[PDB]
Amino acid sequence: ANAFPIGLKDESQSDYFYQWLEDGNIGIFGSAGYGKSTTMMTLLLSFAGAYNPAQLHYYIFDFGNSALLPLRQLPHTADYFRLDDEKKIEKFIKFMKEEMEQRKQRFMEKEVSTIKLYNALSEEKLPIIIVALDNFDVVKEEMPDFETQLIQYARDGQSLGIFFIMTATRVSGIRPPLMNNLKTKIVHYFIDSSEKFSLIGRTPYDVDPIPGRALIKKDNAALTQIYLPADGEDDIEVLENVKREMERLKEVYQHIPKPKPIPMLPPRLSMSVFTNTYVQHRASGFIPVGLDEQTVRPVAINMRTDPHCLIVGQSRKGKTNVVKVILESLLVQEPESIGLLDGIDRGLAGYANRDDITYIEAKERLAQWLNEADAVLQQREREYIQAVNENRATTLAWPPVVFVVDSLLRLQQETDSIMQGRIANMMKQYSHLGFHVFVAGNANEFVKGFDALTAELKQIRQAILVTKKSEQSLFALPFTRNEQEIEPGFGYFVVGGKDQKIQIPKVE
Ligand SMILES: CNc1ccccc1C(=O)O[C@@H]1[C@H](O)[C@@H](n2cnc3c(N)ncnc32)O[C@H]1COP(=O)(O)OP(=O)(O)OP(=O)(O)O
After folding, report:
1. Which of 440, 374, 368 is nearest to 407 (CA)?
2. Residue ranges of the FtsK domain?
3. For residue 131, what are the β-bridge partners?
4. For residue 64, which atom of ligand 1 is closest to its CA?
5. Long-range contacts of range 367-375, CB-CB < 8 Å, 24 or more positions apart?
6. Residue with CA nearest ligand 1 atom 28
7. How many CB atoms lie within 10 A of CB 153?
8. Contact 446/475 with Cβ under 8 angstroms?
9. Ligand 1 centroid vs 470 CA: distance in angstroms?
């Protein structure tokens, strides 16, 4: 449970025990082909057998030669990193900074120093995070940014319940801060004599003749034979039984929730893949518009609280795509009617033939749809008023009567003062009775328009921007000089003052 036996000490004989937490970070050292990765594999499997996946999280950085590739199958492993996975390692650095910062807040909120205290008092436990790193030499030379973070994890992490394990072929070159934080040190055979001398550490010879100066030996070193991770007579038999060992851990920890992999944005994102894999909420009155940039989770429009939405931007392709993302997501719901007013370019002609979609082009056809829409909304208004006057609980949600517009300029041309005022009144009257409006156009069109219809649209506080925040005077948002360019399938989701970057999926 606590004392993990990792090897047989040379002197009957007793096992060398590694105390949980107390013995701190582990530092595996030695020349090539002397059991650095086996010691790594023995440690990680030993801890996995005692603690749950929910209690113990691994993040294996295998930069050696795929020696820790079997450990990828473990339920304890959150993610597995290689030298080629640079973008994944960069995100991990961001993840740990946020995770450590969040930990420090929770510790300070409940007035505690160590993780052992926090988990004891708090009912919701935090997982122990071991950062396994095979081959430190390659990190030392080729990855100085990651090296800086590894020193921070070893120093500050242990108190927050974030331990660190690493193998290294050349100790001469490792910084004293990193070396000192490595509490436990497993030292395998070395070829060079100079490499051994540095691992001896402080001795009574280091003590100068000064009253008060002294060496404090906590515990003596021990010559130990490290156990193999599984029984076997050769490398293949051990590797086979190591696989069989993990199959048991998978079976034993079946109901225990597994750790989340590091969230990553795909290079290409379609609507079909977005709806199937990522979108796993499928709630009524929620239109998923795209994945968040940082967290990589579906962001959605709450139709009950925020019924209307603007699609602002210069890009014709960008706006039209966002309309299709909304139309596709609206079809998953059970709408009463959808009045699609397409622009002068007939881009959304494919949605015309589909069910529950009235394709609008001329002015006369728009008037017919407004009559059908208003007739339904008038009935809902009666049921709402009758419910309040009879002291009854009002209906929570209705089938959405949506009015999608691909072009604001086309809407103004196809309507007059009377018809524009009618639509504006419908928004004022029926916004709480399942009426929705999705307009698309340039930023200046909303601002320049002082007509009855456009005056109502400019007051809508929710929007999907497919343009820069600096290049619009509609929503007062935070921005800077060095703002990111608006590439295809990228925009901002504005709602209730706040905003966030999102990856908008392409509708084929
Ligand atoms: C990943 N290699 C193995 C995994 C399980 C069993 C054997 C091996 C193996 O390749 O054979 C060697 C010993 O049998 C096996 N071994 C360890 N302890 C042993 C022990 N107590 N008895 C017998 N063999 C042992 O270690 C191996 C040499 O060191 P290793 O490759 O583990 O690490 P490294 O090369 O020092 O560093 P890196 O992999 O990062 O380059």
Report:
1. 440
2. 13-197, 296-473
3. 164
4. 40
5. 367/419, 369/337, 369/339, 370/339, 370/419, 370/422, 370/423, 370/426, 372/337, 373/337, 373/339, 373/401, 373/403, 373/426, 373/435, 374/426, 374/430
6. 33
7. 21
8. no
9. 58
